[PDB]
Amino acid sequence: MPDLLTNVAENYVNQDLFAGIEWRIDQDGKPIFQGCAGVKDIETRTFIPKNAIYRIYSMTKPIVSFLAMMLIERGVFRLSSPIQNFDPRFKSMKVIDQHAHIEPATALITIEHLLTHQAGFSYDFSLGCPISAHYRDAQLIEDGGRDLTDMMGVLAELPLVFHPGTQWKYSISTDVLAHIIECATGERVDDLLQRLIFDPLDMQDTGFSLPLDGASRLMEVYGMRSLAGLPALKPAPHVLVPADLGSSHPTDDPDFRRGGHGLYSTLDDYMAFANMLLSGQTPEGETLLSPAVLKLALAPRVHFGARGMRINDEPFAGYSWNLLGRVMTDVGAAAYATHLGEFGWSGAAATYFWVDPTKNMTGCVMTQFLGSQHPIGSDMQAAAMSMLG
Amino acid sequence: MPDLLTNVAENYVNQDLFAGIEWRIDQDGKPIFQGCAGVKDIETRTFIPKNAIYRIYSMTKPIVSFLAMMLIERGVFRLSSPIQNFDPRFKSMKVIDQHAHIEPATALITIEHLLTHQAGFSYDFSLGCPISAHYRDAQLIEDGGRDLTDMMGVLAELPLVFHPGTQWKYSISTDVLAHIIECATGERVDDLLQRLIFDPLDMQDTGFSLPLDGASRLMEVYGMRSLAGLPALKPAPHVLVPADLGSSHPTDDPDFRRGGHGLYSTLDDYMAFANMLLSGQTPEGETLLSPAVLKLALAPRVHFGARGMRINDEPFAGYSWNLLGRVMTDVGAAAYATHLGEFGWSGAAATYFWVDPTKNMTGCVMTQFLGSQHPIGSDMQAAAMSMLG
Amino acid sequence: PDLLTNVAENYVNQDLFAGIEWRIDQDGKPIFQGCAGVKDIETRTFIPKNAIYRIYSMTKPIVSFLAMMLIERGVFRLSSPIQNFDPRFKSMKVIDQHAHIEPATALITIEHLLTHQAGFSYDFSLGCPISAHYRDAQLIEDGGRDLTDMMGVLAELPLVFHPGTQWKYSISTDVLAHIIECATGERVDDLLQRLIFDPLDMQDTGFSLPLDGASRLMEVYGMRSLAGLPALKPAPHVLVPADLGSSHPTDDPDFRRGGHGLYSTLDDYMAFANMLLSGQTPEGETLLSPAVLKLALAPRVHFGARGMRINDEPFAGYSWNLLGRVMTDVGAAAYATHLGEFGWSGAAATYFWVDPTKNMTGCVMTQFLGSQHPIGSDMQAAAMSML
Ligand SMILES: C[C@H](C(=O)O)c1cccc(C(=O)c2ccccc2)c1
Ligand SMILES: C[C@H](C(=O)O)c1cccc(C(=O)c2ccccc2)c1
Ligand SMILES: C[C@H](C(=O)O)c1cccc(C(=O)c2ccccc2)c1
Secondary structure, eight states, X not given: OOOHHHHHHHHHHHTTSOSEEEEEEEETTEEEEEEEEEBSOTTTOOBOOTTOEEEOGGGHHHHHHHHHHHHHHTTSOOTTOBGGGTOGGGSSOEXXXXXXXXXXXXXXXXXXXXXXXXXXXXXXTOTTOTTHHHHHHHTTTTOTTSXXXXXXXXXXXXXXXXXXXXXXXXXXXXXXXXXXXXXXHSSOHHHHHIIIIITTTTOTTOBSSOOTTOGGGBOOXXXXXXXXXXXXXXXXXXXXXXXXXXXXXXXXXXXXXXXXXXXEEEHHHHHHHHHHTTTTBOTTOOBSSOHHHHHHHHSOOBOOOTTOEEETTEEETTEEEETTEEEEOOGGGOSSSOOTTOEEEEOTTSOEEEEEGGGTEEEEEEOOBTTOSSOHHHHHHHHHHHHXX | OOOHHHHHHHHHHHTTSOXXXXXXXXXXXXXXEEEXXXXXXXXXXXXXXXXXXXXXXXXXXXHHHHHHHHHHHTTSOOTTOBGGGTOGGGSSOEEEOTTSOEEEOSSOOBHHHHXXXXXXXXXXXXXXXXXXXXXXXXXXXXXXXXXXXXXXXXXXXXXBSSOTTSOOOOOTHHHHHHHHHHHHHSSOHXXXXXXXXXXXXXXXXXXXXXOTTOGGGBOOOBOOOOSSSOOOSSOOOOXXXXXXXXXXXXXXXXXXXXXXXXXXXXXXXXXXXXXXXXXXXXXXXXXXXXXXXXXXXXXXXXXXXXXXXXXXXXXXXXXXXXXXXXXXXXXXXXXXXOOTTOEEEEXXXXXXXXXXXXXXXXXXXXXOBTTOSSOHHHHHHHHHHHHOO | OOHHHHHHHHHHHXXXXXXXXXXXXXXTEEEEEEEEEEEXXXXXXXXXXXXXXXXXXXXXXXXXXXXXXXXXTTSOOTTOXXXXXXXXXXXXXXXXXXXXXXXXXXXXXXXHHHHTOXXXXXXXXXXXXXXXXXXXXXXXXXXXXXXXXXXXXHHTSOBSSOTTSOOOOOTHHHHHHXXXXXXXXXXXXXXXXXXXXXXXXXXXXXXXXXXXXXXXXXXXXXXXXXXXXOOSSOOOOOOOBOOOTTSSOSSOTTOOOSSSOOEEOHHHHHHHHHHTTTTBOTTOOBSSOHHHHHHHHSOOBOOOTTOEEETTEEETTEEEETTEEXXXXXXXXXXXXXXXXEEOBOTTSOEEEEEGGGTEEEEEEOOBTTOSSOHHHHHHHHHHHHO
């Protein structure tokens, strides 16, 4: 019953493992626990500003996935839609394996494959993956200044690493999804996110560029995990040194937009999104997604074998995959406190959130550390679970 | 919360993909959404008439299957009854495989096998099926003027494509069921349907021939999918050209009757049948099928492997098979909005219906297009699901 | 008809190879031989007398034979763990295509090196979980790095399977050359000179050019590049001179490798191939006993349905012995051969074979990297058909 959340965060700051941390836990749509620890940057020790801004990386994916579900509801496409219907550059895909064998794909990539990371795409930083070296040579993630549409043209020429539908591998497929959304609608994904999600939820600080007053609110990002170079064979030491993002994550590029990363947000903005996922509605009662399609989106859809869900061989114990991210399907296999049906996702800079329908609960932890050797997100979830009976 | 049903239907009509569409959604036995779009025929653009008549094709199957369950309840036969007990022409069946090997069947075909499409029968238009070419040579479906009893004599001489009970393949077995009903009762299947189902439910426009005033109400049927010829290796283009049914679907043949297709019906008539499936009762409370046997009929009975339920390799994602048609058994595998336990079926001319017990809901979409490249039925179900919370 | 000349002249006439030499011996004496084309298409110089070729992986049967001689002499044995000779190869790790890394559950042995079952990879192995890290380390590209130092960099990288459990064509012959140096205290080039080249009078074979060698070196063509990533589809087969960077020096007195790097001539390599019919020099001096030669030639790795493959190219009907390929099923073979035919080939399209049933040897010398045409096998097939 003590405040384990503050204890976790203060200990991380006091041990020089994270510069600054913010968190909020809501229940029934209202804050029940919240706090902050540390500073905006350790170089000057400026205090965490009001409505501090974070690079949320793959916490972009549940947002872009939710947009796709809205467009499915509105009839733009369906889960079974072949993506080549919208961009013929994804016609005639090939599949490569670890033995240098290449053959034509025997199934078409669908919207559902993109949402479930079963399309056969890879990721630039996937260690040991048969094709990731070719992704890195193409600078798919590193070259943030390249237009989404043009990056997709380069990706489309590369082989998949399995036949669509047959395996699971966490991937660039959410970026493909953002692009296919643009093809299917004739609109830009950032404009669609603004009009259909951010504005109805009053997420005024969320987007692919900083707000006008955003520079002074941007949290510094730390860590040794590097985008420029080969995936490491052992984790870099966990040290608070400012991270060099190269040109991968611009702050003021009006055309920068992605599906798998790239949003800036705030704790308050992301909690508005997370709370919405408990119902599909805005706080006033506008429906962003009907209950039936929200249930379709949250139902466990990819189930895993004995070794479970893994990303670069890191486990997500007891989790299955739904159309928006992870979902807890076996508390008896879980590695940290949770409840059946808890869902959410996380980002490369150690941001983390969850939604727990059994407790009408949402939680989010914001920090900026790339390559963390400490699972701060899960530690904060566990603390909150222990505090909510 | 907008009227997604009207949007789906109007868009289909405005894009010249369907000539005319009617739909109705009922909840608690009363209409909650309904509409119509387009025309009876694009040649004259005559408006959709009152109580327009549709060829419902395989939406005949749930009706004939329901009749069989009524006869099981009344003791005429049982699920385990070997059909050869009623027609010895189905004694001594043979089984053929894709390697030209023929051997005697090692199990007897039962009523249950017929209801579950596990008897080993095929269908004339089954692409790649070892025996479908012999079905087509025999004109089993094409020759609508042939008496059901005589068509069955020709079918009975052909081999099955697997041993009864061992596999699932959507088939002519509902026509065998209609015939075996005639053998077991000494009555005609159309008279039994009239007396036991249509008349109690006041389905006055449903039958294997047009009503006296029916000609002016019959919707035109469109599409390129052809009965006369080999199953196509790629889908014919989706174009609104009137379809030539040959002699396969007579309008005024007093002896035409089948189990798997051939009924004419109306939106209002079919909704009466669908609403009945929520309880087994007529609106006044007469019992057509007891709750226990209705539960037996709706329980998931055939379960599918990783590739799922497929018909000509088209998927029915998340569906299992019960004694009347499809039933949703995993929302997390579903490809469009649904709820656990949703059941129903559909027909070759794109008619579609569903029953959703979790919402006390029924829905039906009526149109006439053979070989549709657009899944209008599932699109309308998804719209209705999104509108009903 | 002279099928050999017809194959070679067609290859030259279609602008697919600049110059080709071949010789086929039976009972130690030439029965077929010829040349076609030129040393270089730029100046159209004729193929010189005693023309010199980069033989690339035809280095491997020579270094493997040396290892068998050292086994016979007791320096080490097939079962020797290589970590006994270089402890940098203690505590190896294994990586897989799912980013999982774990300790190796078996020690790498001499036999593993000779059979490419040690778990090593190659820089240009397309799709291989670890080849990107080989290329980042420039293991093959950096020819000026001493063998010993290159091995230190390699030893820190994970294997791609547990030693002994799979087959993958690999840098393991370079590891073998290095372990030979550790075990003997001598350099591999000096050992090759004393034990093989001098007894066989292979005066033009070595890791550097002879003093008069520059004018005899054949030009090398092709677009397959060591620099960048392995290509997802073959580069066009066009006669453009190849850029070897610093991978294959001509006059570095310390350059030595196990898997590539020798210069040789047609005559020199035929002396080596003819020796493999007996283990003896033409004068009758024994280089390797009959018993150990049999041990070296016996089929040792057998392959599944996919068969033996290197970057997914098949070697149909071939198994692997301690020196290279060996034909074990003529009914699976894709070109004329006999049971027991053995040999190997190199990246610049050089090829040789030994056919014990016919007391026959053959070698085709050319210089083309990334060939889209199997000139070696076409010439073997032509020679087989002319018997
Ligand atoms: C998967 C990972 C995440 O969001 O978890 C992700 C997605 C997209 C981009 C990036 C990066 O920019 C990055 C930065 C430093 C090192 C490696 C990658 C990381
Ligand atoms: C399976 C299919 C259905 O009801 O789904 C069906 C059942 C019975 C008859 C027919 C046809 O007449 C037909 C018409 C045109 C092309 C192919 C078949 C079609
Ligand atoms: C496997 C291959 C062979 O001998 O078959 C080989 C072994 C060693 C070195 C090289 C190269 O230098 C090279 C040159 C151009 C392209 C790629 C590699 C090639």
